Amino acid sequence: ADMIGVKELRDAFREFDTNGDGEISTSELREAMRKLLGHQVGHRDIEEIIRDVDLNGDGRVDFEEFVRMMSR
Structure with a gap:
């Protein structure tokens, strides 16, 4: 639920x-x-969400993508 x-x-x-x-x-x-x-939540979990992807120069993330990395 919520x-x-x-x-x-x-x-x-x-x-x-x-x-x-x-x-x-x-x-x-x-x-x-x-x-x-x-x-x-374990400092490791947070670093993980930040580890999934990697910057490169134009790394951009919209609320959806952001929430998705979450709501996933």
Whole structure:
């Protein structure tokens, strides 16, 4: 059902969504992950979500993709 989590991601995007039409970079999300949720999940889990993908120069992630890395 509705588990406490997504709601935190939605607010995260609006908070990190600078002005690129609603888009964040792994860097922004990386800091967001460390800020949102926090521990209680194993610092390893967070680093994992950040390990799944890797930057290259134009690494971009939209709320959907971001939430998907989660809602996955």
